[PDB]
Enzyme design. Sequence first.
Site, PDB file in Angstrom:
ATOM      1  N   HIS B 250     101.675 -36.419  61.968  1.00 23.74           N
ATOM      2  CA  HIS B 250     101.611 -35.343  62.917  1.00 23.74           C
ATOM      3  C   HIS B 250     102.098 -35.841  64.245  1.00 23.74           C
ATOM      4  O   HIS B 250     101.772 -37.009  64.596  1.00 23.74           O
ATOM      5  CB  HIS B 250     100.169 -34.838  63.030  1.00 23.74           C
ATOM      6  CG  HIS B 250     100.070 -33.484  63.610  1.00 23.74           C
ATOM      7  ND1 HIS B 250      99.974 -33.275  64.969  1.00 23.74           N
ATOM      8  CD2 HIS B 250      99.977 -32.260  63.030  1.00 23.74           C
ATOM      9  CE1 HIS B 250      99.892 -31.979  65.198  1.00 23.74           C
ATOM     10  NE2 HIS B 250      99.936 -31.333  64.037  1.00 23.74           N
ATOM     11  N   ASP B 305      98.853 -29.181  56.464  1.00 23.68           N
ATOM     12  CA  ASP B 305      99.701 -28.608  55.391  1.00 23.68           C
ATOM     13  C   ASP B 305      99.452 -29.225  54.013  1.00 23.68           C
ATOM     14  O   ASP B 305      99.978 -28.746  53.019  1.00 23.68           O
ATOM     15  CB  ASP B 305     101.150 -28.654  55.815  1.00 23.68           C
ATOM     16  CG  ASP B 305     101.404 -27.964  57.232  1.00 23.68           C
ATOM     17  OD1 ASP B 305     100.910 -26.793  57.493  1.00 23.68           O
ATOM     18  OD2 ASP B 305     102.060 -28.642  58.105  1.00 23.68           O
TER      19      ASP B 305
END
Lengths: 369, 369
Positions: B250, B305
Site C-alpha cells: 500500500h 483488496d
Amino acid sequence: ENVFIKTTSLTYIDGENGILRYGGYDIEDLVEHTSFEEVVHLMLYGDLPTKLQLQRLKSALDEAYEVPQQVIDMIYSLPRDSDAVGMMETAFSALSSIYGMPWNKATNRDNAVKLVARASTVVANVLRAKEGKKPAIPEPSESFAKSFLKASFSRTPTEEEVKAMDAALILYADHEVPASTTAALVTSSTLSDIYSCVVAALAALKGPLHGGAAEEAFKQFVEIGEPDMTESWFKRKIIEGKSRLMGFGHRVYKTYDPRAKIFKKYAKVISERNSDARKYFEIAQKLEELGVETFGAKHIYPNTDFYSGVVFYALGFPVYMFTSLFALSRTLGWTAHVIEYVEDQHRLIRPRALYVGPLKRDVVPIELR
Amino acid sequence: ENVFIKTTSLTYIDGENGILRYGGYDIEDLVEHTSFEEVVHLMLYGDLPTKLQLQRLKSALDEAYEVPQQVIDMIYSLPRDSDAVGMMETAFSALSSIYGMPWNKATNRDNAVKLVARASTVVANVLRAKEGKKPAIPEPSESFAKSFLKASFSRTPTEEEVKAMDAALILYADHEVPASTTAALVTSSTLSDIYSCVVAALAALKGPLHGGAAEEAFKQFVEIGEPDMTESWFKRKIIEGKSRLMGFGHRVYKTYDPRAKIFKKYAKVISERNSDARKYFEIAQKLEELGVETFGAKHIYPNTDFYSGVVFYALGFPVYMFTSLFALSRTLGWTAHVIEYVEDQHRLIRPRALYVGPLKRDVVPIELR
Ligand SMILES: CC(=O)SCCNC(=O)CCNC(=O)[C@H](O)C(C)(C)COP(=O)(O)OP(=O)(O)OC[C@H]1O[C@@H](n2cnc3c(N)ncnc32)[C@H](O)[C@@H]1OP(=O)(O)O
Ligand SMILES: CC(=O)SCCNC(=O)CCNC(=O)[C@H](O)C(C)(C)COP(=O)(O)OP(=O)(O)OC[C@H]1O[C@@H](n2cnc3c(N)ncnc32)[C@H](O)[C@@H]1OP(=O)(O)O
C-alpha cells in the site's frame, strides 16, 4: 492557482494582443481557408492534412456515424425536457460501454476520429428527441458540417449555412483548460477509455458555472424582443441595475476575443434570410455598440459567447441546444488533450486531503445518543 | 505531487500505525457496533445518529429505491458482456438527467441519501442484467445490506451474509483522494449535480489503473484453483517470476491495512457454507501466509483488496461485479467529499496549459502540402 497541469502543442493564446492559434495557425486563417475535417487532422496529428490524409479521414468519419440502435433508444427514452448536455452524457456513457478500447499509441487518433463522428450523431439525435421527431443518422456528404445539419433538420442546408456551421465547429474546438478538459484529463490518468473521458467532460460542462454561457448571452436578446427596445433594456438592466453584460469580458483576452469577430461575420450572412433570426442579430449588434461604448475603456469587449447563439439560432437550433453545440466542437479539443496527456505526460492523478476533523472517539450505543 | 486539494473531516489515516477512522471513530468500532445506515449519517452529518435521526434516514432510503423504468431499460439494453462499472456510469447519467438538482445547503445531504439508495438499485440490476434475470427493485427491510442482497439474488440472505455485506459497505466507504474522488471534485466545481459528480467518478473508476484491484487479487486464487496448488503457484509466479503479489502492499499503510483484517474475519464465516467459496478462502489464507513470510520484512502486507473478493464471492457475486461493489460503498465517500467541497471550499477549477507547440505559420493550400 495558475497551476500548469500539462504542456500542450495544441492551442496558443495571447490575451494582450487578441491572438488565438491552433498548432501555429491563426484561427482566422483556419476558418477562412480550411474546414473542420482539416482542423480535426491538425489537432490530432499536428499538421494540416495532404489530399490523401484528408481522404482517409473523411472515409473514417463516414463509417463511424452509425451507432447501435440502443444508443438512439436511450436518448429517446429520457424526459424530453432533460438538459441536452445530460442527454449527451448518457449517450456517451453508452458509447463508452459499447466502443471503449484501451489506450494504444497506434490507434488513439483513429479512436478519436470515430468519437467526433459519433458526437455528430448524438447531438443531432438529442435535438430530434427533444423536438419529438423521428431519429436520423448522419450520412456521407461533402462535409461534416453538412452531414450534421442534414441529420439535424431533414432538409438540405444552403452553402452559407454549411460554411457558418463549419466555422462554429472550428471556433469552439479548443481553448484554455476549463473544468471539462480537467475532468477529461483526470479520467484519462487511470487509462479510462476516450469515450469515458468525454463523459467526464460532459458531466462537468453540465454545471452552471461552466455550461450555459451562449444561452445566457442570447437570452438577453430574447428578453429585449425587438431592436427598438435595446436601449431601454440596456438603460434599465446594465446602467441602473449594474448587471454585467453577458457575452462581454474574458479572463485572458483584454481585447475583442478573436472568435467573436468571426462568429459575427457568419451571423450576418445567415441571419438576414429569416426575419426572427435577423431581429436577434440586430438586437445583438445594437447591444454590442452600447457595450463597447460603456465598457471598452475597461478592456471589456465581446467574447466568443456573444454572437455564437445568433449563428446557431439562424441555423435552426433552439436555445436549449447551444451548449451541446459547443460540446460537439469541443470533443476535438477534449480528445486531443487527453491523447497528448496519456502519450507524453501520463502521471496517475493522486492528490491528498488534509484531515481537520474530530479526534479519536468511541462509539456509543444509540440509546445514549 | 503531495498536493493538498482540500481539507476534510471525513477520514483519518495513519499509515505508520495502521489506523483508519471515519469522523474520529476507528473503523473496527464502526463495523462491530454500527451499520452502514449509521455510517451514511456520520459521513453526511458529522455524527452517529440518534434513534429518530436513524429512523428518518431509513424512511428516506426506502422511498428512494424506486427509479423510473427507463433507467432499468437502459441497463438491460447494454451488451451483457459490458464492463459493470460502465453500466453503472450509464445508469447514473440517466439518473442525473431525471433527478439532478442544483446545489442547496438545506437539501444536499437528503439528495446524497437518495443517491446512495439508488446506487443499490443500480448495482443489483447491473448484476441481474449481466446474468439475464428479470429486474428487481430493493424493498424495505431490516437493513440496507439486506435489501441489496435480496434484490440482487431473489432469496433471503442469512444474518451472517447480511452482516458481511454491511461490513463491506462500511469498509470501502472512503479512503484517500483517488482519481475517482478527484473527478467528482472537479465536476462539483462547476456546480454540476451530485449524480453527475458520481458519473465522473465512475468514468475514472472504469480505468484499469484505478478499478479492478479486487478482481486482480481474487483472480490469483482462481488461477491456483485448489489449496494444495498454492505453494507451487507462489514458487513459480512470485519467487521465480518476480511478479508482485496482488492485494499486498500500500502507498500509505506500512502495516496490515486495518480493512484487510476485517474483510478476513467476515470471509471466514460465510465462506465455510459453500465448498467453492471455502476453497478460495483457503487458497487466500495460504497465500497470505506465504506473502507475509516473504514480504512482511519489507513492510508489504495484505491490503483491503486481498480478502474483499472472497467476501463478495461467498455472498454470490461473480468476479465481474467486484469493482461495482466497491463503487456502491464508495458513493458515500464521493457524495460526502463533494458536499464538503462545495459547501466550504468551492473554488472553480481552472488550471493552465503551457504552450510548447509550433510558432506562427501560414495555411498553405492542400495541393502544396
Ligand atoms: C457559464 C455561465 O453561463 S456563466 C457565463 C455568463 N457570464 C457572462 O456572460 C459574463 C462573462 N464575463 C464576466 O463575467 C467577466 O467579464 C470575467 C469574469 C470574464 C472577467 O471579470 P473580472 O474578473 O471582473 O474582469 P475585470 O477585472 O477586467 O473587470 C474590470 C471592470 O470591468 C467590469 N466588468 C467585467 N466584466 C463585465 C461585463 N461582462 N459587463 C460589465 N462590466 C464588466 C468589472 O466589474 C470591473 O468594474 P469596476 O471598474 O467597477 O471594478
Ligand atoms: C487498479 C488495479 O487493478 S492495479 C491493482 C493491482 N495491484 C496490486 O494488487 C498490487 C498492489 N500493490 C502495489 O503495487 C505496491 O505494493 C504499491 C504500488 C501499493 C507500493 O509499491 P512500492 O511503491 O514499490 O512500495 P515499496 O517502495 O514499499 O516497495 C518495497 C519493496 O517491496 C516490493 N513490493 C511492493 N509491493 C509488493 C507486492 N505487492 N508484492 C511483492 N513485492 C512488493 C518492491 O518491489 C520493493 O522491492 P525491493 O526491496 O526489491 O526494492
